[PDB]
Every structure is written in structure tokens, then in C-alpha cells.
Amino acid sequence: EVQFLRTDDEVVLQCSATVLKEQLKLCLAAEGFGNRLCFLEPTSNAQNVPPDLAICCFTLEQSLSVRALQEMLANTVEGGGHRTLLYGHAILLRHAHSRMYLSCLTTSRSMTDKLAFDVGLQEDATGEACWWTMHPASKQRSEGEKVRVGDDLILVSVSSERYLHLSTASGELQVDASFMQTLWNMNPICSCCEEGYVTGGHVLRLFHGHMDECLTISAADSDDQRR
Amino acid sequence: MSFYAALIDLLGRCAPEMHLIQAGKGEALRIRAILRSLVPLDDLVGIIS
Amino acid sequence: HVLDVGFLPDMRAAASLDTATFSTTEMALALNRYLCLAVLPTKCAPLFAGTEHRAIMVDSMLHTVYRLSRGRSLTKAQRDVIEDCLMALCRYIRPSMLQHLLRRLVFDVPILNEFAKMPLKLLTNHYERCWKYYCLPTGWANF
Amino acid sequence: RLQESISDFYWYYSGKDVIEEQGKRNFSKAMSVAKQVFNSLTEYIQGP
Amino acid sequence: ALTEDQGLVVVDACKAHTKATSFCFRVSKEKLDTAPKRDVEGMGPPEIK
Amino acid sequence: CGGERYLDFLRFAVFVNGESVEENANVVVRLLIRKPECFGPALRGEGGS
């Protein structure tokens, strides 16, 4: 049957736009430790050369209502989870890798003479700018419905009061949240996994013999160039 | 001339209160920040001068 | 702004029975001068022109001053003298030689109150002015 | 729909300790309507 | 991957044809064609512990 | 000319008795970001005049 987007499940944002009259496969990402500003990772050429999806993997930390979030804000002083997501709830994305939370930033770029607020990864979830709110793209759904997989979403910022946006310009496709309510698809990369079993994305060490062998490339400063 | 003067009349008039909500509530700060961005300073002074 | 905006009025195009077209610029001080009355923060800019510019309008009544706006315009000078740190001696010379001395009682009694507020604001504590030292007693004698 | 609405009202008054008279009067009106829908819901399934 | 110019070797990401680079596991070294594939959108069962 | 009359009616919503009502002002400023993106690239920010 049709699955639903449960909390505490890994996920990846997704969008598409036309540059040569073709729906390019794109996804948001960010390096984290270094340039904190987010950047766009193309994936349309995945058949002929694969992308780097490790940084792209986001995680749903929790979700709640707007008024409950405001009460959490007022109650700044500090269970089972898996609450199903509904439209109008205040989502909270998180970078699975860097452990830095997605948020808006009080910056500007490209000199639009207008708010851009280039999105990035805040170092801590404290403060109200970190939180985001979902909304429905297609009219066939409405507020309060149980959000499913595949349907298009319209993420909105809480504090900035600005909508996520794929900004096409002269340069590379910027993802500043400035102008337009872009149809942001929401691909579940993974979900609750079984204990003690292998899945994609998990990094592992290959053993041989009984225990005392490991596949590896030679260390650096070597004549083989580590190949 | 009349159109832009009326437009800034609306935009200037709808500031958050005078000082009541500005001294603490967040809605006033958000509205004032977006309000200052669209028509930044060092353009009013040229036009009035 | 007090360097620029205050200097846009070229004495507000003061009437000589030849100027009754730009009457709206007289009422432009309803909003423009109200800010000056409200706010009261070295002589980096020439404030002396602003003080005497207000002193022209409080006394002048040739153009139709629209008496509610006359009270409004009086409030600006009344607010300016309180905050002033004695940078109005040049402007202080003019009211001494008129109003009660040269009789303009119809348009000097409110100015008389504004001038009456001047000496009480400064006892002989942290100021001295030889030119103003003898001007005020001479005006007091004559008045 | 009524559940989401009344739940949001609880969050608005959660920080406040004492409840206003007007607030309690409003909430009682909503509660009475909620009672009637519960009884009407019961009669569709009372009797197997 | 296996680029075949030298043999089994670790190639750069920008030269991956998704057939030399692609790999798969197997239950045992017994020769089985494994012609009928399988597919499911969900998690599926856990096979490899 | 057409815009000035509509903006005049929008003016009369807000300055009721020398104040600024927050609710109507809030809805107005949210709506004013989108639909006044017209009037050319001057105030839109895409230009710069």
C-alpha cells in the first residue's frame, strides 16, 4: 500500500527544473564543516555516472503544531516518537551527517535588491529560525491530511516568513529562499531499519579469513598513487 | 510622482504600532525588517533633498 | 537632514502679495517640522539659520498662516530653545530689538512667553557672553 | 477538524494559569457541541 | 571498478560507467544464473546480517 | 492612475483614528510582497532604478 512519511526517518529533498527542456533531477545538500551555505547536487546523469548522496541525507528530528512550537519557544528552558506527519505541522530537518540543523540565515547574494536569505546549516537547534513549516502544493490534498510519499510539498520558514525557492540566475542554480513556492518533492531515502542487519549507506569494513584480514588501499605517500 | 508618494504613504503608515509591540513582540521586528529592506535608507534623503 | 531639509524652504517663499500658489509647501511643515518639534538630541551644520528661519514665521503674518498651524509652528521654536546649549546668541539678538520694544503686541505676546523662558533656563552658572551681557538688561529696561 | 481546533485552544491557554471567564464560557459552548456529536456518533453503531 | 586497462583498480568517480563499477553479492560460489530478478519499493525482508 | 485609487482605499483601512491596526496591516504586507512585484523591474529589484 501507499506508505506515509513517518518521523525519525531519513529523507532527501528533491526538485526539478528545465535548463535544456528536460526535467533535471536535483537535490539539496551542504558540506557542513567548511562552507556552511547549502548548494545544489545534480543527479540527472546517475545512469551514466553516479552522484555523491552521502551529504544529501537529511533526517526528520521531530514535528508538532505551530502553537505548540510557540509554547516550546516560550518554554525555552528544557519518547516513542514516530508520529505521522500532517500538513500544517512545523517540521524540523537535520543533516544526518554533519549533525547541524537546517535553518535560514541573515545574508544576501546576487544583489537582487530584495530578500534572498541564503539557507544554511545552523550549528544548534536553539532559536526559532531553525524550524520550518510544510504546506500543500497540489489542491487534491488540503490541510490536516496525512502526507504521503511522492506528493509535492511547499516548505516555508517560520521566523523568516519566506518560502523555499529554486533560484535560477546567470550562474549555477542557486537554492536561496527568496521568491517562488517551488514544488519540493520529498523522497524517503530510508526509514526504521532492523537491528543487526545491513542497509545501504552504512559504511562497513570487509573482513576475510577468520578475523585477521581487511581489504584496503595502501597508505598515502606511495608509488601506487592509492589505486 | 503621485503613485509612488501614495505607495510609500501606505507602507509608512502600516508600521507596527508606535512603540507598544515594538518593545518586545517579534511580529513587529519581522515586519519592520522586511519594511526597511524594500526602500532602504540613503534614498529618502536624496529624494527629500 | 537639518542641513538639507530645513534649507529647502527659501524662507518658505515668503509672501509679498505676490505668492499664493505654493500654499501647500506651507502645510508641508505639518509633517516635516513635526519631527523637528518631537526630537531633541558642536555646530557641525548651520543651526543658526534654522533658528532665525523659525523666528521669521512666528512673527510673520502677511501670508495666510492658518492660525492652528501658527500654534503648530510656535511649538518648534519653543522646543528648540530648551535643548539648545547656547548656540542661539545670533538669533537671540533679533527678538530683543522688537516685540515689546517695537510694539507688535498682536504678534509678539506668544513670542514674549518664548523669550520669557530663556533666562530662567540659565542661571549665571556655566555661561558668559559680553555681547549678550548688556543686551538683555537694555531690553529689560526698555520693555 | 474540531479536535485540531480545540487542541490549539489548549496550547494558547497552557501558559496562562487562570482562565478568563469569557474563555471558559466559549470553551463550554464548544464542549456541548462536542458532546452532541459523540452521542450521534454512538447511535450509528449501538446495536451490532 | 574494473576498467580493464590494468585490471581490478579503484577509478575516479567521474569515469564510472555503472557496469564496470557495479558489483553484487551472492549466497555462494555455486554457479547460478539468477535470471529472475526481484523488486519492491518498501524495505523488504532483512537477508544479510 | 488606476493604482492610486486602489491604494487610497487601502490607505483608509489602516489609519483609523490615528493608529495602525495590526491584523489588516499584517495581511496587507504579506499580500503586498507578491502582487506588487509588477510596476516594472524598478521597485521589484530585478532592475535597480
Curated annotation (Swiss-Prot), chain A:
Domain MIR: 82-137, 144-189, 195-227
Tissue-specificity statement: Detected in skeletal muscle (at protein level). Fast- or slow-twitch skeletal muscle.
Post-translational modification note: The N-terminus is blocked.
Cellular localization per UniProt: Sarcoplasmic reticulum membrane
Record's function text: Cytosolic calcium-activated calcium channel that mediates the release of Ca(2+) from the sarcoplasmic reticulum into the cytosol and thereby plays a key role in triggering muscle contraction following depolarization of T-tubules. Repeated very high-level exercise increases the open probability of the channel and leads to Ca(2+) leaking into the cytoplasm. Can also mediate the release of Ca(2+) from intracellular stores in neurons, and may thereby promote prolonged Ca(2+) signaling in the brain. Required for normal embryonic development of muscle fibers and skeletal muscle.
Domain notes: The calcium release channel activity resides in the C-terminal region while the remaining part of the protein constitutes the 'foot' structure spanning the junctional gap between the sarcoplasmic reticulum (SR) and the T-tubule. Pore opening is mediated via the cytoplasmic calcium-binding domains that mediate a small rotation of the channel-forming transmembrane regions that then leads to channel opening.
Comment field (misc): Binding of [3H]ryanodine indicates that the heterozygous channel is activated by Ca(2+) concentrations 4-fold lower than normal. Single-cell analysis of cotransfected cells shows a significantly increased resting cytoplasmic Ca(2+) level and a significantly reduced luminal Ca(2+) level.
Family: Belongs to the ryanodine receptor (TC 1.A.3.1) family. RYR1 subfamily.
Name of the protein in question: Ryanodine receptor 1
Organism: Oryctolagus cuniculus (Rabbit)
Gene of this entry: RYR1
From Swiss-Prot, chain C:
Gene (name only): RYR1
Residues of the full protein shown: 2520 to 2664 of 5037
Organism placement in taxonomy: Eukaryota, Metazoa, Chordata, Craniata, Vertebrata
Protein family according to the UniProt entry: Belongs to the ryanodine receptor (TC 1.A.3.1) family. RYR1 subfamily.
Intrachain disulfide bonds: none
Protein name: Ryanodine receptor 1
Subcellular location: Sarcoplasmic reticulum membrane
Assembly notes: Homotetramer. Can also form heterotetramers with RYR2. Identified in a complex composed of RYR1, PDE4D, PKA, FKBP1A and protein phosphatase 1 (PP1). Repeated very high-level exercise decreases interaction with PDE4D and protein phosphatase 1 (PP1). Interacts with CALM; CALM with bound calcium inhibits the RYR1 channel activity. Interacts with S100A1. Interacts with FKBP1A; this stabilizes the closed conformation of the channel. Interacts with CACNA1S; interaction with CACNA1S is important for activation of the RYR1 channel. Interacts with CACNB1.
Domain-related comment: The calcium release channel activity resides in the C-terminal region while the remaining part of the protein constitutes the 'foot' structure spanning the junctional gap between the sarcoplasmic reticulum (SR) and the T-tubule. Pore opening is mediated via the cytoplasmic calcium-binding domains that mediate a small rotation of the channel-forming transmembrane regions that then leads to channel opening.
Something else known: Binding of [3H]ryanodine indicates that the heterozygous channel is activated by Ca(2+) concentrations 4-fold lower than normal. Single-cell analysis of cotransfected cells shows a significantly increased resting cytoplasmic Ca(2+) level and a significantly reduced luminal Ca(2+) level.
UniProtKB/Swiss-Prot annotation, chain F:
PTM field: The N-terminus is blocked. Channel activity is modulated by phosphorylation.
Tissues expressing this chain: Detected in skeletal muscle (at protein level). Fast- or slow-twitch skeletal muscle.
Coiled-coil segments on the chain, per record: none
Function recorded in the entry: Cytosolic calcium-activated calcium channel that mediates the release of Ca(2+) from the sarcoplasmic reticulum into the cytosol and thereby plays a key role in triggering muscle contraction following depolarization of T-tubules. Repeated very high-level exercise increases the open probability of the channel and leads to Ca(2+) leaking into the cytoplasm. Can also mediate the release of Ca(2+) from intracellular stores in neurons, and may thereby promote prolonged Ca(2+) signaling in the brain. Required for normal embryonic development of muscle fibers and skeletal muscle.
Comment, domains: The calcium release channel activity resides in the C-terminal region while the remaining part of the protein constitutes the 'foot' structure spanning the junctional gap between the sarcoplasmic reticulum (SR) and the T-tubule. Pore opening is mediated via the cytoplasmic calcium-binding domains that mediate a small rotation of the channel-forming transmembrane regions that then leads to channel opening.
Additional observations: Binding of [3H]ryanodine indicates that the heterozygous channel is activated by Ca(2+) concentrations 4-fold lower than normal. Single-cell analysis of cotransfected cells shows a significantly increased resting cytoplasmic Ca(2+) level and a significantly reduced luminal Ca(2+) level.
Family indicated by similarity: Belongs to the ryanodine receptor (TC 1.A.3.1) family. RYR1 subfamily.
Protein's UniProt name: Ryanodine receptor 1
Organism: Oryctolagus cuniculus
Chain's gene name: RYR1
Span covered, complete protein: 2326 to 2374 of 5037
